[PDB]
Structure 1
Amino acid sequence: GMTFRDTSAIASWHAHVYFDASSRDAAWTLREQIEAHWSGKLQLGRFHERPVGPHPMWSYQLAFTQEQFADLVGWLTLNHGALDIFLHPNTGDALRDHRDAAVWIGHSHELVLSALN
């Protein structure tokens, strides 16, 4: 049986906007709106135009606190268009968080979990 955890186990969240060559322009446009809308509320990573790390799509990262989660995730849910977004909590166990605690705005993708740990 699984042991239940409290939300205090979550130190922070990462979201990754996924895209590819076909959706690059749309991804860029959303990234500019995130900059415009969320300056100081999250850390925005580089625009990766290849698969990096465990990500099977081109991507960029947003890193944010539990206190920003509802506002930012709600806004992304409303405004993501056709871009899939991968989200996961950071609990101190990268493989477990990616393998077992993946959240998707839009469609899910099979991660490159073998890249972890």
Structure 2
Amino acid sequence: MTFRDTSAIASWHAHVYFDASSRDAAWTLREQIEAHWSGKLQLGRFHERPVGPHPMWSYQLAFTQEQFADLVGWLTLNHGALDIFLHPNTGDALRDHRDAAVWIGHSHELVLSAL
């Protein structure tokens, strides 16, 4: 393979994964993300069903390479028992999710057929 630089990355997404057992925790973290960054981070719907490539219930957060250290550091400290799926967006969704998956906690098998 050939080495790429970080300019390849357009944006990052993080997806907070949860289920019925962890719904309250996921909602609390959502409220805290809103508060901590004062609603300046793009935030998707609180999906209580599997959507797209996501095998768990999820919600999406979007941010840049320039916010990556702050957001990922903070999520690493504060995610609790919730797994978080992170991936860069480079313009090739399948490649990004298949090959550039990062996980805070534990990894999950994605529904790649959705991409």
TM-score interval, smaller chain: over 0.9
User: Identity of aligned pairs, percent?
Assistant: 100
CA distance in 2, matches of 1:35, 1:82: 19
Superposition deviation, residue 108 in structure 1: 0.3
CA distance in 2, matches of 1:38, 1:109: 28
Task: Give deviations 1:25-76, integer Å, cap 9, x for gaps.
Answer: 0000000000000124410111000000000000000001111110000000
| Runs of 4+ with >6 A deviation | none
| Structure 1: runs of 5 or more not aligned | none
| Structure 2: runs of 5 or more not aligned | none
Contact map agreement 1:41 1:64 (CA 8 A) in 2: no
- Cα gap change, 1:40 to 1:66, in 2 (>3 Å): farther
CA distance in 1, matches of 2:95, 2:40: 26
Contact map agreement 1:41 1:68 (CA 8 A) in 2: no
CA distance in 1, matches of 2:97, 2:40: 23
Q: Please state if 1:55 is matched with 2:58.
A: no
SS of the residue 2:82 aligns to: coil
TM-score, with structure 1 as normaliser: 0.96
SS of the residue 1:104 aligns to: strand
Contact map agreement 1:88 1:97 (CA 8 A) in 2: yes
SS of the residue 2:27 aligns to: helix
Task: Give deviations 1:2-43, integer Å, cap 9, x for gaps.
Answer: 010001100100000000000000000000000000124410
Q: Please state if 1:111 is matched with 2:110.
A: yes
In structure 2, the partner of 1:74 is: 73
